[PDB]
Each structure stands twice: as structure tokens, then as C-alpha cells.
Amino acid sequence: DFGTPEMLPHVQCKNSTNSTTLVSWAEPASKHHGYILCYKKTPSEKCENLANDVNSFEVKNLRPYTEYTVSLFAYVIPAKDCNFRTKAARPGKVNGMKTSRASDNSINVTCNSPYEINGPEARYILEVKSGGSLVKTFNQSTCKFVVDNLYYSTDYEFLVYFYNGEYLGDPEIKPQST
Amino acid sequence: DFGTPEMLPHVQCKNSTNSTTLVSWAEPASKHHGYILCYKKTPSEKCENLANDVNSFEVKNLRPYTEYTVSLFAYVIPAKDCNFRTKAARPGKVNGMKTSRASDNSINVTCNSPYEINGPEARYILEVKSGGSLVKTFNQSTCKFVVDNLYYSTDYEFLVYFYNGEYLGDPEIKPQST
Ligand SMILES: *[C@@H]1O[C@H](CO)[C@@H](O)[C@H](O)[C@H]1NC(C)=O
Ligand SMILES: *[C@@H]1O[C@H](CO)[C@@H](O)[C@H](O)[C@H]1NC(C)=O
Ligand SMILES: *[C@@H]1O[C@H](CO)[C@@H](O)[C@H](O)[C@H]1NC(C)=O
Ligand SMILES: *[C@@H]1O[C@H](CO)[C@@H](O)[C@H](O)[C@H]1NC(C)=O
Ligand SMILES: *[C@@H]1O[C@H](CO)[C@@H](O)[C@H](O)[C@H]1NC(C)=O
Numbered sequence: 001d002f003g004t005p006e007m008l009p010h011v012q013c014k015n016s017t018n019s020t021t022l023v024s025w026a027e028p029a030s031k032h033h034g035y036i037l038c039y040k041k042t043p044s045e046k047c048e049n050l051a052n053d054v055n056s057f058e059v060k061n062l063r064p065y066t067e068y069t070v071s072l073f074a075y076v077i078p079a080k081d082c083n084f085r086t087k088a089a090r091p092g093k094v095n096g097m098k099t100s101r102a103s104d105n106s107i108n109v110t111c112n113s114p115y116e117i118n119g120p121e122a123r124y125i126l127e128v129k130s131g132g133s134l135v136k137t138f139n140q141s142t143c144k145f146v147v148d149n150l151y152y153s154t155d156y157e158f159l160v161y162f163y164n165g166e167y168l169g170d171p172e173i174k175p176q177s178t
Numbered sequence: 179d180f181g182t183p184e185m186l187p188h189v190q191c192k193n194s195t196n197s198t199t200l201v202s203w204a205e206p207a208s209k210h211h212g213y214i215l216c217y218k219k220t221p222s223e224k225c226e227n228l229a230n231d232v233n234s235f236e237v238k239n240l241r242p243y244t245e246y247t248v249s250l251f252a253y254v255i256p257a258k259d260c261n262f263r264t265k266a267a268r269p270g271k272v273n274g275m276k277t278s279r280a281s282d283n284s285i286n287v288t289c290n291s292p293y294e295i296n297g298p299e300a301r302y303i304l305e306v307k308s309g310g311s312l313v314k315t316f317n318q319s320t321c322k323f324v325v326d327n328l329y330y331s332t333d334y335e336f337l338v339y340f341y342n343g344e345y346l347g348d349p350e351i352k353p354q355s356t
């Protein structure tokens with residue numbers, strides 16, 4: 001109906017930066033208005049000629065946990081797009097793992113996300129070991145752990161794994177004494 | 179016309195793996211056929227409510243050298259999609275840089291692509307230094323360099339930079355003697 005959320009014509013957005021753009025549109029004199037800005041990555045179609053007279057094809061080299069759309073075209077020598085999602089895989093290792101003394105018997109552990117997530121979620125698992133024995137374990141949304149109440153002159157190992165909702169990746173291991 | 183490249187109905191593609199899928203379609207008894215399989219990443223629209231009665235908006239936190247599409251919706255409190263591309267940025271550092279002796283006065287240098295490309299191309303720049311002086315330079319598509327005819331008992335530094343068609347990133351530096 002008139003005044004309900006409708007798409008706006010003549011929108012400008014080309015004045016971009018490496019990480020931003022300025023989106024601008026016509027100024028209505030008329031009344032008071034609310035707005036919804038919508039955006040997505042423009043994906044480019046990748047086409048290939050298969051072998052003649054084949055019934056199936058294995059599409060390879062796809063990224064894990066990614067939504068894709070396929071279409072087939074035939075020629076002699078309404079059709080809907082087919083949607084699928086690749087299965088999840090093991091994520092990569094965390095980046096920039098830093099182990100630091102917070103106090104006399106306290107250690108602070110920080111890291112940044114892996115580049116390859118490969119799944120629906122993002123969690124950080126920290127294992128704390130001494131002489132190969134599990135001393136403490138933590139599971140968080142943010143890779144900022146405060147590990148306190150440890151023994152005074154002890155060698156500890158800190159193992160941070162990324163969890164993507166389906167898989168645990170390899171740990172980034174860092175030694176740190178008290 | 180009849181027999182020219184037309185989109186095929188009833189295509190199946192859901193039996194995926196972490197990096198592949200099986201795409202299958204109806205077997206025509208009729209004649210001999212050629213095929214084009216087309217695919218792309220299905221991008222998800224990200225919508226947000228802006229402030230009321232505004233004329234412009236700065237879309238931030240975008241990836242460098244990425245194509246995007248924007249649309250605006252107004253409501254009281256044919257319109258085309260607007261396409262743009264973020265500008266290029268400095269790529270990241272190369273991964274897994276390995277320096278090895280190929281012979282007595284020969285060194286082999288290998289690395290893998292950075293995670294962040296941020297531009298249209300992919301090239302590897304290798305600088306070879308001795309006592310801070312530039313000895314050799316190479317520019318290649320593949321990060322596999324064979325550095326021969328060096329002096330016999332000399333310390334050299336190998337600096338590999340990634341070039342993305344617009345920017346050079348930071349070097350990965352590795353010492354290697356002959
Ligand atoms: C992808 O799946 C195969 C089959 O299970 C597995 O061997 C491979 O490790 C997987 N990749 C990752 C990164 O999980
Ligand atoms: C340890 O991290 C906490 C935040 O999680 C912070 O308040 C504290 O100052 C940090 N200590 C050191 C030594 O960085
Ligand atoms: C970490 O916690 C989440 C809940 O917040 C849970 O679903 C997940 O299973 C835990 N991590 C691992 C590695 O299982
Ligand atoms: C993005 O652009 C700004 C402005 O020139 C610059 O300071 C910043 O370093 C750029 N980022 C990269 C990774 O090139
Ligand atoms: C050096 O690399 C070349 C390929 O570029 C290969 O033929 C040669 O065997 C390599 N040598 C060593 C020591 O790996």
C-alpha cells in the first residue's frame with residue numbers, strides 16, 4: 001500500500017573505500033520516513049562446458065559450509081536454480097596467540113580468529129596443562145581468558161582450539177610459567 | 179530456438195561434501211547433447227534499520243576489492259539495485275615460506291598464497307639481499323623460486339612480498355646461507 005516499505009529509485013553508492021562506501025538517495029520534502037538499507041556480496045557466475053552426453057557431474061574445489069546455486073544448460077550437438085550448502089570442515093588454527101603474566105599465579109591468554117571458520121559458529125577452547133595433565137578448561141565466544149589461582153613457580157602449557165559448531169581444529173600451543 | 183542452450187528443469191545437487199557436490203539431471207533419450215554447468219556462491223542479504231529522516235549512510239566493515247549490491251526501502255513513520263566495488267587494499271603476508279639449499283651455491287624458495295588477496299591479481303616478488311644490498315629480484319605467478327649462482331659461504335636474506343595488481347604487502351623474511 002502507499003507508504004509501506006517500498007524500494008527506492010536513483011540510489012548512489014560508487015564512492016567506495018577499501019572497506020566502506022557512501023550510499024545516498026533522493027530527499028523527500030513530503031513527510032517523516034524510516035529506512036532499511038540492504039546489502040550483499042555480488043557473486044559472479046562460473047560456467048563450464050562438461051563432456052557431451054553426461055547425466056551427472058562432480059563439482060569440486062568448493063569452500064566448506066558455503067551456500068551455492070547451480071544451473072544447467074543443454075544444447076543439441078519454469079526451470080529453477082538448484083541450491084545447496086557444502087558440509088562443515090575442521091576450522092584453522094587461531095592467529096596471534098599471546099600468553100602473558102597477569103599476576104604472580106595468574107596468566108592472560110589472547111588470540112584472534114582463524115582465517116578458515118568452515119562452520120556455523122565461533123568458539124574458543126582453552127586447555128591448561130601441567131606435566132601433561134589437564135588442569136583447567138574454558139569455552140568462550142571471545143579469545144580473552146584469565147587463568148588464575150595457579151601454583152607459584154610452575155611451567156604450564158596453554159592450548160587454544162577453535163570450535164565452529166561442528167568441529168574442533170588444531171591447537172595453537174604456548175608455554176608459560178608462573 | 180529449439181535445441182539452443184536452454185536451462186534444464188529438475189536438477190539435483192544436495193548430496194554435498196565439505197568441498198564437492200554431485201549435480202545430476204534427467205537423461206534425454208532423444209539426441210546427442212552438450213552441457214554448461216553454472217554455479218555461484220549464494221550471498222545472503224544483510225538488512226539494517228537506519229536513523230529516521232536521513233539522506234545518506236556510510237556502509238562500513240566491507241572486504242577490500244569485493245563487488246556488492248545495495249537497495250533502500252522507505253516507509254512513512256522500476257527501482258534498480260545499486261552495484262559497487264570496494265577499492266583494493268594491501269594484501270597479507272605469504273604463508274609457509276620455506277628456504278632450502280638446492281646445491282652448493284643454489285637456494286630454493288617456496289611459499290603459499292596469503293589469506294587476504296585484496297586485489298585483482300596474484301604475484302610473488304622475491305628480493306635477495308647480502309649485507310643489506312639487493313643482489314637479485316624475481317616476479318612470478320607461482321611462489322617457487324630457484325636462486326642460483328650465489329657466492330659459496332655467504333649469508334643471504336630472502337624477502338617474499340605478495341603483489342595483488344595494485345599493492346605490495348609486507349615481506350616474509352628468511353635467512354639462508356650457502
Ligand atoms: C573434508 O572431508 C574429508 C572426508 O571426510 C576429510 O578427509 C577432510 O579432512 C575434510 N577437510 C577438513 C578440513 O575437515
Ligand atoms: C588480563 O585481562 C583482563 C581482561 O580480560 C584485564 O582486565 C587485565 O588487566 C589483563 N592483565 C594483563 C596483565 O594484561
Ligand atoms: C562450547 O560451548 C557451546 C555452548 O556455548 C557448546 O555448544 C559446544 O559444544 C562447546 N564446545 C565444544 C568444543 O564442544
Ligand atoms: C585502507 O585504506 C586506508 C586509507 O588509505 C589505509 O590507511 C589502510 O591502510 C587501508 N588498508 C589496507 C589493508 O591497505
Ligand atoms: C628446487 O626446485 C626445483 C623446481 O622449481 C626442483 O627441480 C629442484 O629439485 C628443487 N631442489 C630442491 C633441493 O628441493
Ligand SMILES: *[C@@H]1O[C@H](CO)[C@@H](O)[C@H](O)[C@H]1NC(C)=O
Nearest residue numbers: 301303317318341343345346
Ligand atoms: C610483476 O609483473 C607484473 C607483470 O607480469 C607487473 O604488472 C607488476 O608490476 C610486477 N610487480 C610489481 C610489484 O610491480
